[PDB]
Design an enzyme around this catalytic site. Sequence first.
Site, short mmCIF file in Angstrom:
data_model
loop_
_atom_site.label_atom_id
_atom_site.label_comp_id
_atom_site.label_asym_id
_atom_site.label_seq_id
_atom_site.Cartn_x
_atom_site.Cartn_y
_atom_site.Cartn_z
CD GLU B 50 -2.18 -1.08 3.00
OE1 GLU B 50 -3.23 -1.27 2.42
OE2 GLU B 50 -2.00 -1.26 4.30
CD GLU B 126 -3.92 -7.23 2.92
OE1 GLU B 126 -4.85 -6.74 3.55
OE2 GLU B 126 -2.75 -6.66 2.72
CG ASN B 193 -7.56 -7.37 11.66
OD1 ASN B 193 -8.46 -6.72 12.21
ND2 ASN B 193 -6.39 -6.85 11.30
#
Lengths: 408, 204
Positions: B50, B126, B193
């Site tokens: 990212e 992901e 997560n």
Amino acid sequence: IFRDVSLLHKPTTQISDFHVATRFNDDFSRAVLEAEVQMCGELRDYLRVTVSLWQGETQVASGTAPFGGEIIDERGGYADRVTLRLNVENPKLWSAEIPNLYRAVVELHTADGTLIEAEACDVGFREVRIENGLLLLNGKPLLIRGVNRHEHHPLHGQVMDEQTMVQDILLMKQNNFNAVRCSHYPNHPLWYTLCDRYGLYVVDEANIETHGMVPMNRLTDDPRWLPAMSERVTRMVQRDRNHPSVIIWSLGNESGHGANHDALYRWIKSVDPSRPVQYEGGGADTTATDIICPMYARVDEDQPFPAVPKWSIKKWLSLPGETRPLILCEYAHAMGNSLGGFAKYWQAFRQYPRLQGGFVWDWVDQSLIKYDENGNPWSAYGGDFGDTPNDRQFCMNGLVFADRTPHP
Amino acid sequence: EANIETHGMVPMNRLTDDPRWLPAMSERVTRMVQRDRNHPSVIIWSLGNESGHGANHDALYRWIKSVDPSRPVQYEGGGADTTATDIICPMYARVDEDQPFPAVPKWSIKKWLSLPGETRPLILCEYAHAMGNSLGGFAKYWQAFRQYPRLQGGFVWDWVDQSLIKYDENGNPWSAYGGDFGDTPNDRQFCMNGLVFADRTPHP
């Protein structure tokens, strides 16, 4: 003798054939109309050809020349041919949305202005191309809302008439159809003309179906049938090539996949590169088709028959190495109380670019009229004529009844 | 994966498109390769995460390809299918539904593959955000993976909960998260997560 019979009187020195072609520039603001003319008879230097393009009453362009083409090879050129090229600025384009048409007149005259004879045809300016996996019409990608249609009349059997053609056309247009497939042979001539005029995309198909052989290939893979097949393709092209409504050529139907197809497909590509060729036989994605064009492939589920599976359409496209557009030659079998799931299809079509629609199967019920004990008519089907062997109702899969009244 | 993430810039590209960061970035990629290149377990190199898509990535991707052609390179930034990746590797792309954000949409995975001109394999960097009571729909993914060849799976996000241990008034421990250390600013539970708790005990 189910289509017409005519007599034609031609001059001794005449026009033997002619073709039209239209090239465009990057944005379609300019086109070239190219006409190739050939003649038969004695070639005399005073002979000329004039090709004029009208738009209505208004002549848009004209060209005149005498016979004799460019050098083609070591022996020269065609002395009995001539090709003209007319420039057209900001041509009105033909499409099923707006069937802009021009008239082309081909005059064969002498130089002193005397007319030996004239021929003509309607012209539609359009470009058809597969580019980058997409099928484009005049630069934008089509979404084919089509249906397969047979030449069928409950009363007349397979004899076609103008009224019937027109009815069909209007119903289709009214009902949101763009295109029709000539399942599974060349149609009555007038058909193209109407489509040209009312605006429908047409897939012209060779009269070749050997469905009943085992395996399917049997004849189409046999060099001895090559000639016969060959004539079914070539003549179709020579005859229908100038119609704008025709945007795709098809090699036939359900005849498996043979070396004869490969040859014929190459032939077409050579002769008329203006249109794509399609053929479903042998798996729907052979080397003989420019488009993946299966019949009855489901949206989401695969049907993996040996040799010739039918993948889910969404999946078919991303199989490794695949890049062609996919348009179903037949889908959504409209037999009796049917059409369930129709929407699933519409939705994929709308979400996946390379899914450019398909042809529903089919237009009209192939039922025939019979009469009872009191001269009362009734709709007959397979085996109702003591016909053997037969497929009963299988001949009724239309969206409309034989009388042209709609099924829900 | 290279230690490079500039998620917080605006736009994301800002540094990665800047020649002045080229060197710094460069070292984060090159040294990784020089160090790990001999391990068999490593089968794919990744340029970072990212950090949008900049000319610096393109260069670095080419560098790797030159130096070690034994492995493919992947990078998701800038749309997941840039010229800097050998694999379409999006994050959170749905199976069947598209999410067409401007500039960087996330097509449905089945659809992404057949976009015109596309031919690379697709593996999600992901997918299936395992935050708390989650993993619904996991099976949908498994099924596409199984039906489409070019869908070669993905990486679930993520393994362990990034919770930390804190102690109470009686030396009793408890699982802490974002902002529980008076930390500012913070993302609270967003750090949890995992499929397993920080102690390595599984979530259902």
